[PDB]
Structure 1
Amino acid sequence: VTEFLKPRLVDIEQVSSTHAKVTLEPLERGFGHTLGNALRRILLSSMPGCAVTEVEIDGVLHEYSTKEGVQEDILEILLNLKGLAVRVQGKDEVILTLNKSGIGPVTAADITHDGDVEIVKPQHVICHLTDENASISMRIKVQRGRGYVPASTRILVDACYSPVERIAYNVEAARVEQRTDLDKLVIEMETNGTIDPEEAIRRAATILAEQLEAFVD
């Protein structure tokens, strides 16, 4: 009458740290499918996290600038900065600046390693190699927010608060004893990193269960 089943088999197979797929056990009808829809809509349209937003480099502020030997235009450097989920432990958005030699190999560790400012992949290029040896200040900022917000209206490069890259859900069929009407759920994804899959699933389930105590009261 009211004994409600749930997806018990939560076995997840990960191709790498950036490729994985989790599955749900055969549950009640309409729960795997609608639940998968809700979960994907959640992990996309709202995801808790912190990352870079924009930078303040020395020179002209126009996007149509010259490489001037940097061989890295403003778009190249800004993109190589923005997709890095630059993280601050408990503080608000943290500003960092950098200045180094002209090796050319641009990575993510040359920034001033602050108490709270950190990067998951220290080899993440933030710029393209140059043809000279001058120095300059990056002066970028890493912010934390709710879900994700664009940079076209929230100027300036990109603010990747939601750490989700590509998500999909599929529904399979499973029987119990004679009836196969078990529309089981599974979700497959590829990502950038730093969010453990079971941990992220736990965070989502926790937000959902902690808020769903009111409409039922």
Structure 2
Amino acid sequence: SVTEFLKPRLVDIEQVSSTHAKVTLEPLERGFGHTLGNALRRILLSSMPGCAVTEVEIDGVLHEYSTKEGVQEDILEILLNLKGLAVRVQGKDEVILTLNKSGIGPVTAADITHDGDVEIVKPQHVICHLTDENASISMRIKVQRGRGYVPASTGRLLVDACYSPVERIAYNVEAARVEQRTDLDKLVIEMETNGTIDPEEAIRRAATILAEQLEAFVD
């Protein structure tokens, strides 16, 4: 007993989407449902590494303040919508991609100059809509490697970086029991993620990050 605390097994992957899953553990010792649920939360939401769009250069603009015509939604929205694009960068710190399109209709991330060195993991992401017989737009999009979520605090247009792929993570603890006690915790972790990584593996990455800290103490 004295050093053989109860260990969970995954009760389910409980998967409802490729984007979101409800990985549940049972039993955990009393109170550990927070001690791990939140600990992995704080890892997952803020200290997972990854790659994201970081800066934009649409043709001839000094500030997204300038609502250049030919596009339906103004540049403040194109700027955030380009933050919406999930991307994978292989082996590099920062990479610039180019995008252009022409003709009346939408623009999509599928229209980017796909290097193959970089994967746009969701091509069908609409970027904007075009609004004249002569409508075409061309831009450089910078993608960068980094960690967590970094706000707009630091012709280029700066934007917040979504390096962590976790769109949301949440967790609960709840009653679970065995044949003789009910003071034990279940843990439900729910998370939703941008498609760069599947969640039942993102958590295995995160559990590793946390485990690596302990490696200098564990006997």
Fold similarity call, TM over 0.5 = yes
How far apart, CA to CA, are the structure 2 residues paired with 1:41 and 1:22? 17
Describe the shift of the 1:167–1:156 C-alpha distance in structure 2 as closer, same or farther (beyond 3 A).
same
Which range moved further: 155-164 or 176-185? 155-164
Paired position in structure 2 for 1:192: 194
Aligned residues, how many?
217
How far apart, CA to CA, are the structure 1 residues paired with 2:158 and 2:44? 24
How far apart, CA to CA, are the structure 2 residues paired with 1:19 and 1:207? 21
Larger relative strand fraction = 2
C-alpha displacement at 1:142, in angstroms? 0.8
C-alpha displacement at 1:155, in angstroms? 6.7
Describe the shift of the 1:95–1:10 C-alpha distance in structure 2 as closer, same or farther (beyond 3 A).
farther
C-alpha displacement at 1:66, in angstroms? 2.0
The answer as to whether partners of 1:104 and 1:128 remain within 8 angstroms in 2 is yes
Equivalences for residues 54-133 of structure 1 within 5 A = 54-133=55-134
Q: TM-score, normalised by structure 1?
A: 0.91
How far apart, CA to CA, are the structure 2 residues paired with 1:19 and 1:197? 7
The answer as to whether partners of 1:169 and 1:186 remain within 8 angstroms in 2 is yes
C-alpha displacement at 1:26, in angstroms? 0.9
Residue 206 (str. 1) matches residue 208 (str. 2) = yes
The answer as to whether partners of 1:47 and 1:148 remain within 8 angstroms in 2 is no
C-alpha displacement at 1:62, in angstroms? 2.1
C-alpha displacement at 1:194, in angstroms? 2.1
- Give the percent of matched residue pairs that are identical in Structure 1 and Structure 2: 100
Q: Deviations over 1:103-141 (max 9, x none)?
A: 422111111010322211111012233223243321011
Q: TM-score, normalised by structure 2?
A: 0.91
How far apart, CA to CA, are the structure 2 residues paired with 1:110 and 1:98? 6
4+ runs deviating over 4 angstroms: none
Instruction: Quote the RMSD (CA, aligned, Å).
Output: 1.9
Q: Deviations over 1:141-178 (max 9, x none)?
A: 11110222122329712211011112211112111121
The answer as to whether partners of 2:8 and 2:25 remain within 8 angstroms in 1 is yes
Describe the shift of the 1:161–1:30 C-alpha distance in structure 2 as closer, same or farther (beyond 3 A).
same
Describe the shift of the 1:157–1:76 C-alpha distance in structure 2 as closer, same or farther (beyond 3 A).
same
